[PDB]
Amino acid sequence: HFNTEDNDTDLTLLQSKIATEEVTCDFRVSNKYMWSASTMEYNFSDQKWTSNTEIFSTYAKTSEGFVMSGFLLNPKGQSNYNSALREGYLNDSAYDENQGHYYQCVVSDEDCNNITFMLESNVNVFIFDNDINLIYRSSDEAGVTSYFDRYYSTTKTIAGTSNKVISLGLIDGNYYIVFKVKDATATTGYHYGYYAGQPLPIAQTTTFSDLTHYTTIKWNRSSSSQSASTQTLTINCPSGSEDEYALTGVKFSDKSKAFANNTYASSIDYYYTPATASYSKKLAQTGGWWSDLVDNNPPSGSIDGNYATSVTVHWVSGISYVNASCTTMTQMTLDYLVPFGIIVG
Ligand SMILES: [Cl-]
C-alpha cells in the first residue's frame, strides 16, 4: 500500500533553486545530452494536451500494474516528445480502482535523472522509493533531501491554463509516481503531464557587442583578391557547467552597409572557426549584400571556447582607383540549447 495521506517525519520543505548563469565575452567540450543543431527545442507555449479523458488507460501496464515512465532522449522531432510524455485526467474511469494513477520511474544515469511535472489546479503528485516510502509530495513541495540532486519549481501557462511546473533530479534507483486529486468535488484542473529521462532542451540566444570580421583591407594595386584574419572571441560559461550548454547555430549580423564596399568589391567572403572545432568554415549569405552570415549546422558541443574569424575581399573587374578599400564588421549571435530546471527556469 502507497500511503500518501499520512505525513512523514523525514520530510523537509524543499527549496527551489536554479543557478544564476551568465555567458561572458572577451576579445573540445562535448554536450552531455548529445544535443545539437538537429535537436528539437521545448516550448511551453506549443505544448498541447490530448482532449481524451481516458488517455491514461491507453498505456500498457507492467506485470505489477504500473505504467512505465517515458524517456526523453535527445528529441529530434514531435514524435519523440509524444512518446516521452505521460499524461492523464484524474477524473477518468481508471482513477477509482486504486484512487490514483500509478507509474514506475527507473533512474540509472545522473545525466538522465530528470523528472519534469506539469500539474493543473486539482492535481497532487507523490514520489515513493523502492521500499514504498514517501520521498516527495508536490502539495507543499516536501521531501527526503538525500534522494535529490536538484529541485526547481515555477508556474507556466500551458494550453491556456496556469500549471505548477516542477523539475527535479533524483539519485539512481527505482521509484513510483502516484497522481492524486486535491479536492474530489472540484469542477476543473484534473490534467497532469510529465517527462522523465533528460531535462527539457530550452532554446537560448546571445549577441555579443564586440565586433568580429572587423578590418580595413586596402587594395595592394596588383592582386584580384585579398584576405585578412580578424578578431577571435572567447565565450565563457560559469565554471563546471560547460557541458550544460549545447551549440545549435551561429549568426553574424553584417554592420558594414554604410561603408558601401560594393563600389570596389564584387563580393566579400566571411569565415569563422566555431568553439566546437579547429577548422574554418565559410559562412552562408542568407541573401544579397549585407544579409546575415550563418552556420545553421555547427559541430556539436559547448558554446565555451574561441570563435576565430577571417574575411576575403574579391575586387571588382576593372578596379583602377589607388585608395580603394573595404571596411568589414559583423556582430555575433549564438543559438544554443540549455537544460530546463538546471540553467533556465
Ligand atoms: Cl546535427
Side-chain angles (χ1 to χ4, degrees), residues 146-183:
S146 60
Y147 288 90
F148 295 76
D149 284 333
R150 67 181 205 265
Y151 191 70
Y152 177 74
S153 168
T154 190
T155 291
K156 303 267 172 182
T157 290
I158 302 157
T161 284
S162 166
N163 282 227
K164 191 177 214 161
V165 178
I166 306 153
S167 173
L168 55 83
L170 290 168
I171 64 158
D172 300 335
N174 184 61
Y175 301 100
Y176 304 96
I177 307 180
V178 187
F179 296 88
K180 288 180 102 153
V181 298
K182 271 182 197 168
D183 174 26

mmCIF file of all heavy atoms in Angstrom, residues 146-183:
data_model
loop_
_atom_site.group_PDB
_atom_site.id
_atom_site.type_symbol
_atom_site.label_atom_id
_atom_site.label_comp_id
_atom_site.label_asym_id
_atom_site.label_seq_id
_atom_site.Cartn_x
_atom_site.Cartn_y
_atom_site.Cartn_z
ATOM 1 N N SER A 146 17.986 13.520 0.732
ATOM 2 C CA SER A 146 19.070 12.613 0.362
ATOM 3 C C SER A 146 18.862 11.959 -1.035
ATOM 4 O O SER A 146 19.838 11.524 -1.652
ATOM 5 C CB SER A 146 19.253 11.542 1.431
ATOM 6 O OG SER A 146 18.071 10.782 1.599
ATOM 7 N N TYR A 147 17.614 11.945 -1.532
ATOM 8 C CA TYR A 147 17.219 11.399 -2.825
ATOM 9 C C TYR A 147 17.309 12.421 -3.947
ATOM 10 O O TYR A 147 17.153 12.062 -5.116
ATOM 11 C CB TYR A 147 15.779 10.883 -2.743
ATOM 12 C CG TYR A 147 15.659 9.618 -1.934
ATOM 13 C CD1 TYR A 147 15.416 9.664 -0.562
ATOM 14 C CD2 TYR A 147 15.794 8.372 -2.535
ATOM 15 C CE1 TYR A 147 15.319 8.499 0.193
ATOM 16 C CE2 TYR A 147 15.701 7.202 -1.793
ATOM 17 C CZ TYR A 147 15.464 7.269 -0.426
ATOM 18 O OH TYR A 147 15.395 6.117 0.308
ATOM 19 N N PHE A 148 17.527 13.689 -3.607
ATOM 20 C CA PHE A 148 17.559 14.762 -4.590
ATOM 21 C C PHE A 148 18.937 15.264 -4.843
ATOM 22 O O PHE A 148 19.729 15.446 -3.906
ATOM 23 C CB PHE A 148 16.677 15.934 -4.143
ATOM 24 C CG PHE A 148 15.208 15.591 -4.067
ATOM 25 C CD1 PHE A 148 14.702 14.834 -3.006
ATOM 26 C CD2 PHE A 148 14.330 16.021 -5.046
ATOM 27 C CE1 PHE A 148 13.359 14.476 -2.951
ATOM 28 C CE2 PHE A 148 12.969 15.679 -4.977
ATOM 29 C CZ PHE A 148 12.495 14.913 -3.921
ATOM 30 N N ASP A 149 19.207 15.517 -6.128
ATOM 31 C CA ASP A 149 20.424 16.129 -6.674
ATOM 32 C C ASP A 149 20.146 17.579 -6.930
ATOM 33 O O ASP A 149 21.066 18.400 -6.871
ATOM 34 C CB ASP A 149 20.879 15.441 -7.989
ATOM 35 C CG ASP A 149 21.564 14.096 -7.829
ATOM 36 O OD1 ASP A 149 22.171 13.854 -6.754
ATOM 37 O OD2 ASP A 149 21.538 13.301 -8.792
ATOM 38 N N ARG A 150 18.869 17.893 -7.253
ATOM 39 C CA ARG A 150 18.388 19.242 -7.546
ATOM 40 C C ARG A 150 16.870 19.324 -7.461
ATOM 41 O O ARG A 150 16.176 18.308 -7.594
ATOM 42 C CB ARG A 150 18.860 19.709 -8.926
ATOM 43 C CG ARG A 150 18.246 18.935 -10.046
ATOM 44 C CD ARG A 150 18.721 19.378 -11.401
ATOM 45 N NE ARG A 150 17.701 19.034 -12.392
ATOM 46 C CZ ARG A 150 17.724 17.922 -13.110
ATOM 47 N NH1 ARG A 150 18.735 17.062 -12.985
ATOM 48 N NH2 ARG A 150 16.740 17.658 -13.963
ATOM 49 N N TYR A 151 16.359 20.555 -7.276
ATOM 50 C CA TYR A 151 14.936 20.855 -7.148
ATOM 51 C C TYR A 151 14.648 22.253 -7.658
ATOM 52 O O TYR A 151 15.326 23.207 -7.271
ATOM 53 C CB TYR A 151 14.423 20.713 -5.674
ATOM 54 C CG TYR A 151 12.910 20.760 -5.621
ATOM 55 C CD1 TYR A 151 12.146 19.714 -6.120
ATOM 56 C CD2 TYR A 151 12.242 21.891 -5.162
ATOM 57 C CE1 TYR A 151 10.760 19.792 -6.171
ATOM 58 C CE2 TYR A 151 10.849 21.969 -5.187
ATOM 59 C CZ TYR A 151 10.115 20.919 -5.706
ATOM 60 O OH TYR A 151 8.742 20.952 -5.759
ATOM 61 N N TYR A 152 13.609 22.373 -8.502
ATOM 62 C CA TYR A 152 13.157 23.627 -9.076
ATOM 63 C C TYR A 152 11.656 23.570 -9.309
ATOM 64 O O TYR A 152 11.132 22.570 -9.776
ATOM 65 C CB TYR A 152 13.920 23.959 -10.375
ATOM 66 C CG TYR A 152 13.433 25.225 -11.035
ATOM 67 C CD1 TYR A 152 13.741 26.475 -10.504
ATOM 68 C CD2 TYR A 152 12.575 25.177 -12.129
ATOM 69 C CE1 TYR A 152 13.247 27.647 -11.075
ATOM 70 C CE2 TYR A 152 12.052 26.343 -12.690
ATOM 71 C CZ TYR A 152 12.389 27.577 -12.157
ATOM 72 O OH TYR A 152 11.922 28.739 -12.741
ATOM 73 N N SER A 153 10.988 24.672 -9.056
ATOM 74 C CA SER A 153 9.543 24.809 -9.170
ATOM 75 C C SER A 153 9.171 26.210 -9.700
ATOM 76 O O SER A 153 9.802 27.189 -9.315
ATOM 77 C CB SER A 153 8.935 24.598 -7.779
ATOM 78 O OG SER A 153 7.573 24.958 -7.681
ATOM 79 N N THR A 154 8.144 26.306 -10.555
ATOM 80 C CA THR A 154 7.654 27.567 -11.104
ATOM 81 C C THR A 154 6.183 27.404 -11.556
ATOM 82 O O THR A 154 5.513 26.447 -11.189
ATOM 83 C CB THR A 154 8.589 28.118 -12.244
ATOM 84 O OG1 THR A 154 8.198 29.459 -12.594
ATOM 85 C CG2 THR A 154 8.648 27.214 -13.498
ATOM 86 N N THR A 155 5.701 28.353 -12.350
ATOM 87 C CA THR A 155 4.371 28.371 -12.921
ATOM 88 C C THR A 155 4.504 28.743 -14.394
ATOM 89 O O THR A 155 5.215 29.689 -14.718
ATOM 90 C CB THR A 155 3.475 29.333 -12.126
ATOM 91 O OG1 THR A 155 3.256 28.767 -10.836
ATOM 92 C CG2 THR A 155 2.132 29.566 -12.784
ATOM 93 N N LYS A 156 3.846 27.988 -15.284
ATOM 94 C CA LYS A 156 3.826 28.306 -16.707
ATOM 95 C C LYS A 156 2.398 28.182 -17.212
ATOM 96 O O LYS A 156 1.597 27.424 -16.660
ATOM 97 C CB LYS A 156 4.771 27.398 -17.525
ATOM 98 C CG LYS A 156 6.247 27.390 -17.124
ATOM 99 C CD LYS A 156 7.071 28.378 -17.906
ATOM 100 C CE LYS A 156 8.470 28.474 -17.360
ATOM 101 N NZ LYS A 156 9.280 29.484 -18.097
ATOM 102 N N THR A 157 2.084 28.926 -18.263
ATOM 103 C CA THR A 157 0.793 28.836 -18.926
ATOM 104 C C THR A 157 0.952 27.795 -20.036
ATOM 105 O O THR A 157 1.694 28.013 -20.994
ATOM 106 C CB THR A 157 0.319 30.206 -19.402
ATOM 107 O OG1 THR A 157 -0.020 30.983 -18.252
ATOM 108 C CG2 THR A 157 -0.898 30.117 -20.306
ATOM 109 N N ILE A 158 0.314 26.636 -19.855
ATOM 110 C CA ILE A 158 0.345 25.546 -20.823
ATOM 111 C C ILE A 158 -1.094 25.355 -21.306
ATOM 112 O O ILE A 158 -1.988 25.210 -20.470
ATOM 113 C CB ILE A 158 0.969 24.260 -20.221
ATOM 114 C CG1 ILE A 158 2.404 24.513 -19.705
ATOM 115 C CG2 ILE A 158 0.943 23.132 -21.251
ATOM 116 C CD1 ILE A 158 2.876 23.591 -18.704
ATOM 117 N N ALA A 159 -1.320 25.399 -22.646
ATOM 118 C CA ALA A 159 -2.640 25.263 -23.277
ATOM 119 C C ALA A 159 -3.698 26.154 -22.578
ATOM 120 O O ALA A 159 -4.725 25.658 -22.127
ATOM 121 C CB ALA A 159 -3.079 23.801 -23.274
ATOM 122 N N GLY A 160 -3.384 27.450 -22.447
ATOM 123 C CA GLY A 160 -4.214 28.489 -21.848
ATOM 124 C C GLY A 160 -4.552 28.377 -20.373
ATOM 125 O O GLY A 160 -5.430 29.101 -19.892
ATOM 126 N N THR A 161 -3.883 27.489 -19.638
ATOM 127 C CA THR A 161 -4.144 27.254 -18.223
ATOM 128 C C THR A 161 -2.824 27.325 -17.461
ATOM 129 O O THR A 161 -1.782 26.862 -17.963
ATOM 130 C CB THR A 161 -4.876 25.869 -18.076
ATOM 131 O OG1 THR A 161 -6.238 26.032 -18.464
ATOM 132 C CG2 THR A 161 -4.840 25.295 -16.668
ATOM 133 N N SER A 162 -2.875 27.895 -16.242
ATOM 134 C CA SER A 162 -1.734 28.002 -15.333
ATOM 135 C C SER A 162 -1.389 26.617 -14.769
ATOM 136 O O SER A 162 -2.278 25.944 -14.205
ATOM 137 C CB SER A 162 -2.050 28.979 -14.200
ATOM 138 O OG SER A 162 -1.122 28.882 -13.132
ATOM 139 N N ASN A 163 -0.127 26.189 -14.917
ATOM 140 C CA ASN A 163 0.322 24.905 -14.404
ATOM 141 C C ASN A 163 1.444 25.080 -13.409
ATOM 142 O O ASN A 163 2.343 25.896 -13.655
ATOM 143 C CB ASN A 163 0.847 24.007 -15.578
ATOM 144 C CG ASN A 163 -0.181 23.334 -16.442
ATOM 145 O OD1 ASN A 163 -0.075 22.157 -16.708
ATOM 146 N ND2 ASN A 163 -1.137 24.055 -16.999
ATOM 147 N N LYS A 164 1.456 24.254 -12.347
ATOM 148 C CA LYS A 164 2.600 24.141 -11.445
ATOM 149 C C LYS A 164 3.668 23.333 -12.212
ATOM 150 O O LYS A 164 3.414 22.191 -12.611
ATOM 151 C CB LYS A 164 2.218 23.457 -10.122
ATOM 152 C CG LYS A 164 3.299 23.554 -9.036
ATOM 153 C CD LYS A 164 2.806 22.913 -7.734
ATOM 154 C CE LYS A 164 3.308 23.561 -6.460
ATOM 155 N NZ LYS A 164 2.459 23.193 -5.285
ATOM 156 N N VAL A 165 4.813 23.951 -12.518
ATOM 157 C CA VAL A 165 5.861 23.255 -13.265
ATOM 158 C C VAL A 165 7.016 22.970 -12.306
ATOM 159 O O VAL A 165 7.582 23.883 -11.719
ATOM 160 C CB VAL A 165 6.295 24.033 -14.542
ATOM 161 C CG1 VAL A 165 7.424 23.308 -15.280
ATOM 162 C CG2 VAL A 165 5.107 24.237 -15.481
ATOM 163 N N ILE A 166 7.311 21.699 -12.107
ATOM 164 C CA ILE A 166 8.357 21.176 -11.214
ATOM 165 C C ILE A 166 9.371 20.365 -12.027
ATOM 166 O O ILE A 166 8.965 19.529 -12.821
ATOM 167 C CB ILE A 166 7.715 20.271 -10.110
ATOM 168 C CG1 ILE A 166 6.608 20.996 -9.363
ATOM 169 C CG2 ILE A 166 8.773 19.647 -9.178
ATOM 170 C CD1 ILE A 166 5.518 20.063 -8.773
ATOM 171 N N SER A 167 10.667 20.610 -11.808
ATOM 172 C CA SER A 167 11.797 19.895 -12.403
ATOM 173 C C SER A 167 12.723 19.534 -11.270
ATOM 174 O O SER A 167 13.131 20.393 -10.489
ATOM 175 C CB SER A 167 12.515 20.712 -13.481
ATOM 176 O OG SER A 167 13.697 20.062 -13.937
ATOM 177 N N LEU A 168 12.974 18.256 -11.131
ATOM 178 C CA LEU A 168 13.815 17.728 -10.081
ATOM 179 C C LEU A 168 14.715 16.650 -10.698
ATOM 180 O O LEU A 168 14.445 16.169 -11.797
ATOM 181 C CB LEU A 168 12.928 17.178 -8.890
ATOM 182 C CG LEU A 168 11.818 16.111 -9.219
ATOM 183 C CD1 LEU A 168 12.398 14.677 -9.289
ATOM 184 C CD2 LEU A 168 10.705 16.137 -8.172
ATOM 185 N N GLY A 169 15.782 16.319 -9.980
ATOM 186 C CA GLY A 169 16.744 15.294 -10.340
ATOM 187 C C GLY A 169 16.937 14.343 -9.180
ATOM 188 O O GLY A 169 17.238 14.775 -8.071
ATOM 189 N N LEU A 170 16.756 13.036 -9.423
ATOM 190 C CA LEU A 170 16.875 12.018 -8.390
ATOM 191 C C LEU A 170 18.176 11.246 -8.462
ATOM 192 O O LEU A 170 18.766 11.131 -9.517
ATOM 193 C CB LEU A 170 15.706 11.018 -8.502
ATOM 194 C CG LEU A 170 14.310 11.516 -8.119
ATOM 195 C CD1 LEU A 170 13.241 10.534 -8.544
ATOM 196 C CD2 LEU A 170 14.207 11.768 -6.632
ATOM 197 N N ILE A 171 18.585 10.653 -7.347
ATOM 198 C CA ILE A 171 19.736 9.737 -7.287
ATOM 199 C C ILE A 171 19.319 8.419 -8.006
ATOM 200 O O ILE A 171 18.119 8.207 -8.227
ATOM 201 C CB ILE A 171 20.215 9.510 -5.814
ATOM 202 C CG1 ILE A 171 19.129 8.814 -4.960
ATOM 203 C CG2 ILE A 171 20.684 10.858 -5.180
ATOM 204 C CD1 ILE A 171 19.604 8.083 -3.715
ATOM 205 N N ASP A 172 20.287 7.573 -8.408
ATOM 206 C CA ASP A 172 19.955 6.347 -9.124
ATOM 207 C C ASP A 172 19.103 5.431 -8.260
ATOM 208 O O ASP A 172 19.337 5.321 -7.057
ATOM 209 C CB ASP A 172 21.212 5.603 -9.580
ATOM 210 C CG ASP A 172 22.117 6.368 -10.520
ATOM 211 O OD1 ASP A 172 21.619 7.283 -11.216
ATOM 212 O OD2 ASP A 172 23.324 6.050 -10.563
ATOM 213 N N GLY A 173 18.092 4.831 -8.873
ATOM 214 C CA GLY A 173 17.194 3.908 -8.195
ATOM 215 C C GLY A 173 15.881 3.693 -8.907
ATOM 216 O O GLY A 173 15.662 4.196 -10.015
ATOM 217 N N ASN A 174 15.013 2.923 -8.253
ATOM 218 C CA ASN A 174 13.657 2.599 -8.671
ATOM 219 C C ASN A 174 12.652 3.430 -7.819
ATOM 220 O O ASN A 174 12.760 3.537 -6.582
ATOM 221 C CB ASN A 174 13.402 1.091 -8.532
ATOM 222 C CG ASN A 174 12.056 0.673 -9.033
ATOM 223 O OD1 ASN A 174 11.724 0.840 -10.219
ATOM 224 N ND2 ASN A 174 11.266 0.082 -8.154
ATOM 225 N N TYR A 175 11.695 4.024 -8.514
ATOM 226 C CA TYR A 175 10.725 4.930 -7.923
ATOM 227 C C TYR A 175 9.360 4.674 -8.454
ATOM 228 O O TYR A 175 9.197 4.183 -9.585
ATOM 229 C CB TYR A 175 11.109 6.399 -8.260
ATOM 230 C CG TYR A 175 12.482 6.806 -7.771
ATOM 231 C CD1 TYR A 175 13.573 6.826 -8.633
ATOM 232 C CD2 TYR A 175 12.696 7.141 -6.433
ATOM 233 C CE1 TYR A 175 14.855 7.154 -8.174
ATOM 234 C CE2 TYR A 175 13.971 7.449 -5.959
ATOM 235 C CZ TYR A 175 15.048 7.458 -6.831
ATOM 236 O OH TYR A 175 16.286 7.804 -6.355
ATOM 237 N N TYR A 176 8.368 5.096 -7.666
ATOM 238 C CA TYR A 176 6.965 5.035 -8.023
ATOM 239 C C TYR A 176 6.424 6.435 -7.941
ATOM 240 O O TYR A 176 6.797 7.194 -7.037
ATOM 241 C CB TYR A 176 6.186 4.039 -7.144
ATOM 242 C CG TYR A 176 6.795 2.657 -7.184
ATOM 243 C CD1 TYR A 176 7.680 2.237 -6.195
ATOM 244 C CD2 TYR A 176 6.560 1.797 -8.258
ATOM 245 C CE1 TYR A 176 8.327 1.006 -6.277
ATOM 246 C CE2 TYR A 176 7.183 0.551 -8.335
ATOM 247 C CZ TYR A 176 8.063 0.160 -7.342
ATOM 248 O OH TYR A 176 8.644 -1.089 -7.380
ATOM 249 N N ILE A 177 5.602 6.799 -8.931
ATOM 250 C CA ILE A 177 4.987 8.116 -9.061
ATOM 251 C C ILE A 177 3.484 7.928 -9.031
ATOM 252 O O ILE A 177 2.938 7.169 -9.854
ATOM 253 C CB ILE A 177 5.452 8.829 -10.362
ATOM 254 C CG1 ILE A 177 6.990 8.887 -10.474
ATOM 255 C CG2 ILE A 177 4.807 10.215 -10.474
ATOM 256 C CD1 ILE A 177 7.516 9.567 -11.731
ATOM 257 N N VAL A 178 2.814 8.590 -8.054
ATOM 258 C CA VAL A 178 1.375 8.490 -7.909
ATOM 259 C C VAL A 178 0.766 9.878 -8.028
ATOM 260 O O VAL A 178 1.187 10.793 -7.326
ATOM 261 C CB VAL A 178 0.966 7.795 -6.583
ATOM 262 C CG1 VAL A 178 -0.533 7.555 -6.517
ATOM 263 C CG2 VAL A 178 1.738 6.493 -6.364
ATOM 264 N N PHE A 179 -0.264 10.017 -8.871
ATOM 265 C CA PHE A 179 -1.027 11.259 -9.044
ATOM 266 C C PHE A 179 -2.394 11.097 -8.390
ATOM 267 O O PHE A 179 -3.117 10.149 -8.689
ATOM 268 C CB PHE A 179 -1.167 11.628 -10.539
ATOM 269 C CG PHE A 179 0.139 11.936 -11.226
ATOM 270 C CD1 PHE A 179 0.892 10.920 -11.809
ATOM 271 C CD2 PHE A 179 0.586 13.257 -11.350
ATOM 272 C CE1 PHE A 179 2.100 11.201 -12.444
ATOM 273 C CE2 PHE A 179 1.769 13.552 -12.023
ATOM 274 C CZ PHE A 179 2.527 12.518 -12.554
ATOM 275 N N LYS A 180 -2.732 12.012 -7.478
ATOM 276 C CA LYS A 180 -3.996 12.007 -6.743
ATOM 277 C C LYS A 180 -4.639 13.383 -6.812
ATOM 278 O O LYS A 180 -3.922 14.368 -7.006
ATOM 279 C CB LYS A 180 -3.789 11.565 -5.272
ATOM 280 C CG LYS A 180 -3.478 10.071 -5.123
ATOM 281 C CD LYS A 180 -3.278 9.637 -3.662
ATOM 282 C CE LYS A 180 -4.475 8.930 -3.049
ATOM 283 N NZ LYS A 180 -4.085 7.985 -1.958
ATOM 284 N N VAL A 181 -5.993 13.445 -6.687
ATOM 285 C CA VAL A 181 -6.790 14.685 -6.712
ATOM 286 C C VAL A 181 -6.603 15.454 -5.414
ATOM 287 O O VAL A 181 -6.433 14.828 -4.363
ATOM 288 C CB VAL A 181 -8.313 14.467 -6.985
ATOM 289 C CG1 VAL A 181 -8.556 13.850 -8.351
ATOM 290 C CG2 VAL A 181 -8.980 13.646 -5.895
ATOM 291 N N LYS A 182 -6.672 16.813 -5.482
ATOM 292 C CA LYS A 182 -6.635 17.676 -4.310
ATOM 293 C C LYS A 182 -8.011 17.631 -3.647
ATOM 294 O O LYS A 182 -8.132 17.237 -2.487
ATOM 295 C CB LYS A 182 -6.261 19.106 -4.691
ATOM 296 C CG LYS A 182 -4.788 19.373 -4.693
ATOM 297 C CD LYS A 182 -4.500 20.818 -5.043
ATOM 298 C CE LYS A 182 -3.059 21.009 -5.444
ATOM 299 N NZ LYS A 182 -2.818 22.335 -6.063
ATOM 300 N N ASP A 183 -9.056 18.001 -4.411
ATOM 301 C CA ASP A 183 -10.451 18.051 -3.992
ATOM 302 C C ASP A 183 -11.291 17.257 -4.983
ATOM 303 O O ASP A 183 -11.418 17.665 -6.138
ATOM 304 C CB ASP A 183 -10.904 19.525 -3.919
ATOM 305 C CG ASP A 183 -12.376 19.796 -3.628
ATOM 306 O OD1 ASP A 183 -13.041 18.924 -2.991
ATOM 307 O OD2 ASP A 183 -12.854 20.907 -3.975
#
